[PDB]
Amino acid sequence: MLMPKKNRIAIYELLFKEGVMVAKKDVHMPKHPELADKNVPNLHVMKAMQSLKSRGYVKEQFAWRHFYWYLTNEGIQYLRDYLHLPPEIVPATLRR
Amino acid sequence: KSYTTPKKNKHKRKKVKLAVLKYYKVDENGKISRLRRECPSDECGAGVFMASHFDRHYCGKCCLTYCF
Amino acid sequence: MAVQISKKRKFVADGIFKAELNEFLTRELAEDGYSGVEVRVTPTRTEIIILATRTQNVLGEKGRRIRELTAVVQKRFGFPEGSVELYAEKVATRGLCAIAQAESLRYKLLGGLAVRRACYGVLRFIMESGAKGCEVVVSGKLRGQRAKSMKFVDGLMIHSGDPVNYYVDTA
Amino acid sequence: HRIRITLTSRNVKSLEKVCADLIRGAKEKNLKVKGPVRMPTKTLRITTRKTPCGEGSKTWDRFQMRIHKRLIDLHSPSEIVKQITSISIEPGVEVEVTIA
Amino acid sequence: GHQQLYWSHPRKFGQGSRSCRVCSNRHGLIRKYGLNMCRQCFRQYAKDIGFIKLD
RNA sequence: CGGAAGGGCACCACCAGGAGUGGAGCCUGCGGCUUAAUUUGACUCAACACGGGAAACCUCACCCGGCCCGGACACGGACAGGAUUGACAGAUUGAUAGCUCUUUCUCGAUUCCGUGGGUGGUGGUGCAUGGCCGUUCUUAGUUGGUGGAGCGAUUUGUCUGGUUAAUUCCGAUAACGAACGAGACUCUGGCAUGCUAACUAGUUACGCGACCCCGGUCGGCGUAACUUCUUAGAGGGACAAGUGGCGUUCAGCCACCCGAGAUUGAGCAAUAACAGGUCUGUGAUGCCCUUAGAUGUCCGGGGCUGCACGCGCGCUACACUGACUGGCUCAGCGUGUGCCUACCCUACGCCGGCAGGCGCGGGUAACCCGUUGAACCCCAUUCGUGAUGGGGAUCGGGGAUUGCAAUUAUUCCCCAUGAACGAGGAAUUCCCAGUAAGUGCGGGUCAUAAGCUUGCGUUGAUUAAGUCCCUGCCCUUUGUACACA
């Protein structure tokens, strides 16, 4: 799974600003409808995030066409240890 | 099952040792000499060379051919 | 709206949206005691009411699970941020909502309780909560490979007619 | 100022309450109103297999939803219209406001 | 040429372009009213959509 | 179980009939054969125009060839003196698959190789399954508690007689109290000169404009009212209600007055079971198999459409109550521009016989297609018993549509070719009141498309209101060496 660093960073960055980020069960789609700015093809978001799903840092759920990923607090430090993010900024789903 | 025709093998990459040493020639002065020709494309201006073959040139990504 | 879809195609999409979002939440909110949902369609705002048994688990961490469901519909179904608001409600007389004990039967069976003992638990609770009659069917493979079916029926029940539509609950 | 109000509801009796509420809501405010038109319904005939596989006798399903629609015209300015339709709305009935 | 022979085949038409929205299978589709749904799950999910057999 | 009896019921049963199939042509599916596949499942009612399955590709589950890993995660190497991804040419190739091969330029840590292991499968197992459907069962039967009989298994209630579509009730009664099915409940049809509403519909009157000799017409325009015609909400209306006969005169039955109905049709449909099918509807699934040279995926082509044959669901006719050509005239189910989606119904003037093409516009739909000028049928000529102007099977030439791609003629249009078929044997299918049947139009199937099917519309009958003769269904008595009965 060889993907560019621009596609690598943009997948992880969108997962931190919001506790959820969705995809579709359809490989044959060129661009993700959520992010129409970058490329982010659907086969990149299914498989690279599946690396994070395989090591158990996220909740996994499907609804008829779409994979839903609920990032937990254990996975917040994983993004903090890789993207060099401060702990003061919090995901929008933890904001009250 | 059984296979009659042998499978076509994967392209084993020819690893190049010290690839940058065969880009420039050293001089006793503080100058550098360029052997291969740089690409005139907008994406790559000076840091990308072209494949100087025995009959025509080629650039890796922009697909430009300089024939003779 | 620009493309101006027809009303025939809208309630088909509204029924699909009522089908997908409910079924999305049933598989995800299954350990919480799902009992039903109801959405109100309004201009500029989308009001949806979610009903569940254990109100402690509907929020998670100060409403983290509530806020996670606010952004799922925001990202997939195409709704603005803040245009959808979710309110959690508690179940009244939960012993008559047939899908409430239907999952409760499963987590005793999945947890490690006997097929025998868990069956008493459901029928005692529906009589404890007050039911005129019931129809509890458990079927599948039991104690091997041959399919064995147990049916526990006592009281009053109607299988024919319009009374099936709105007077009883089937799970 | 000849503002149109459209009422679309799946249920039969639930749409009857709201249109009669707007009948009462227009007389209580004393404005010139055109009556709510009992505009014909449409049935979506969906007849498919009851069976998943091809084994069994040929049975056909009979699915029918009867969406029903009303239209009410008000000879009143726009401020009065938004006052009435914004109070006590139910999931069954959809409200559409057309100025012309 | 993997990236160009992967999707050289057009799906502007044909029954492989449209499938179900749950099973994603390419048979028994009710294309009417933009459902994009297989008929087998349509009867199963008739309560979640609304369809009932009154008559 | 009975080719045992007593009863009751049923046009998936009969009589009386009506219309068909089996006879001819064509289409679909199945069996067999064959080839690389002619994928497969299904075999009495419950397989065989069934899987929604009207296949140039996808669907495709099969085969012929070739890509690719989307083998994640973890472990050992490997390397920045470079771990790995990509490629203009020429050969090959089916391709402008660097797929590989002789030749080098680009990639920067995503990552390659071995081990655990994961994932995917219209891969197998419906005799592991769930769920769903169908059947037992189109008929009425069944279960709990208390109590009674029997040592016990068990049985009563769950029924002599009448009656009912019915375990429907009356009524006897070791039964009582209950419960389901039927019944009850819901949707629709004709009755509503009564209400609400209608400028997204019409009606009546008039204003004009036009025609013919005060009157008649104009869906030609507009308007002072309204719902009788258009529609949907509340509804009301039928209950044997009444009368006369039959019957314990009780349950109830028959005929009649008046009244739109004195038996409209459909959905749901008890306990319990089927080794019925579906793993090929599922990100529903147990077990087994493959997982790099793939049963994962992608592309190109072929088959699923082949043909001595047999069978079934279907259409067309076998002609004068008919064929043709003109005039004519009446529908409601419906449907219509889509997340992705690249895809709507069309009005009008045009080019062309035609399929089709060019401009504009209405309609997200009581606004526009459309006031749905749909057919057989009504009228007027030709035909004249000739396999003939019935019949259109086969076949050739030509024009466009849909589609990148039709060759195995996608589909339609023109000319021409003009076969069998003389009312179909043993047999067999459906139906009794808008009923069988003659006939056309919508929806799914659709990019192009109905020889299928669900609905709707026109026309619209013969016979009967009975029976267990045949074939099936539910009880009681009876005999059993059967109990997968």
Side-chain angles (χ1 to χ4, degrees), chain B residues 5 7-8 11 13 18 22-23 49 53 56 58:
Chain B
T5 304
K7 47 164 297 188
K8 187 178 296 180
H11 179 58
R13 298 306 309 276
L18 285 81
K22 54 93 176 177
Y23 280 155
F49 286 129
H53 289 281
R56 79 287 183 274
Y58 173 61

Side-chain angles (χ1 to χ4, degrees), chain C:
Chain C
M1 161 205 98
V3 65
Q4 203 169 38
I5 66 178
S6 174
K7 297 299 289 181
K8 292 173 177 181
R9 309 179 79 87
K10 199 256 185 177
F11 304 121
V12 169
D14 189 359
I16 279 174
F17 181 59
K18 272 190 169 57
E20 187 175 17
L21 183 63
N22 175 347
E23 203 54 50
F24 156 69
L25 183 63
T26 50
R27 304 170 270 250
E28 207 276 328
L29 188 153
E31 78 270 36
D32 210 351
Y34 178 74
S35 294
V37 288
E38 172 83 342
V39 65
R40 289 204 179 89
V41 59
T42 59
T44 300
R45 184 176 179 179
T46 300
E47 172 172 48
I48 175 168
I49 297 180
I50 297 183
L51 194 66
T53 62
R54 286 173 284 276
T55 54
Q56 172 175 23
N57 292 85
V58 308
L59 59 87
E61 189 170 17
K62 72 203 311 282
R64 177 174 174 275
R65 305 180 71 247
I66 308 176
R67 209 158 206 86
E68 283 177 298
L69 295 174
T70 57
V72 164
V73 65
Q74 198 192 136
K75 281 179 180 292
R76 194 251 181 261
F77 289 109
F79 281 142
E81 172 175 23
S83 180
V84 58
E85 201 155 20
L86 283 78
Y87 299 110
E89 288 291 302
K90 202 171 187 177
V91 294
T93 187
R94 61 100 173 175
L96 279 80
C97 188
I99 64 170
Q101 70 276 16
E103 52 94 11
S104 172
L105 201 43
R106 296 174 67 250
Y107 293 100
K108 293 181 287 291
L109 291 203
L110 189 61
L113 279 78
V115 178
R116 177 70 275 172
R117 184 56 188 276
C119 182
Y120 290 162
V122 163
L123 61 93
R124 185 258 201 180
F125 292 165
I126 60 180
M127 295 298 102
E128 179 185 353
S129 178
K132 188 139 87 193
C134 64
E135 185 173 357
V136 186
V137 190
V138 168
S139 178
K141 63 177 73 175
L142 295 169
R143 302 323 168 170
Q145 297 306 125
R146 179 65 96 86
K148 299 289 94 175
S149 173
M150 41 174 68
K151 199 160 174 179
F152 291 84
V153 171
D154 46 349
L156 160 54
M157 71 305 297
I158 300 287
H159 314 86
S160 59
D162 169 38
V164 185
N165 287 121
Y166 58 94
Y167 184 78
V168 302
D169 208 5
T170 318

Side-chain angles (χ1 to χ4, degrees), chain A residues 13-92:
Chain A
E13 197 189 353
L14 202 73
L15 193 65
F16 189 68
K17 68 195 294 298
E18 183 50 61
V20 305
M21 162 285 268
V22 305
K24 197 184 193 66
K25 192 200 168 186
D26 211 15
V27 188
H28 310 115
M29 181 205 48
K31 276 89 178 180
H32 203 291
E34 193 188 333
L35 185 57
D37 206 359
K38 260 74 181 178
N39 278 299
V40 297
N42 190 259
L43 60 87
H44 293 73
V45 65
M46 301 265 268
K47 299 286 104 176
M49 172 46 168
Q50 205 272 331
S51 296
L52 196 147
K53 294 189 287 291
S54 54
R55 41 178 167 267
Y57 293 61
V58 68
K59 190 63 177 175
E60 172 36 40
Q61 183 66 41
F62 193 82
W64 291 2
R65 283 209 87 167
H66 284 273
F67 294 97
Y68 299 98
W69 310 327
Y70 293 166
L71 190 53
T72 189
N73 52 4
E74 211 275 349
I76 301 299
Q77 264 295 343
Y78 174 59
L79 280 184
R80 179 166 298 117
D81 196 63
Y82 175 64
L83 296 168
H84 313 83
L85 299 171
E88 176 52 53
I89 62 170
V90 292

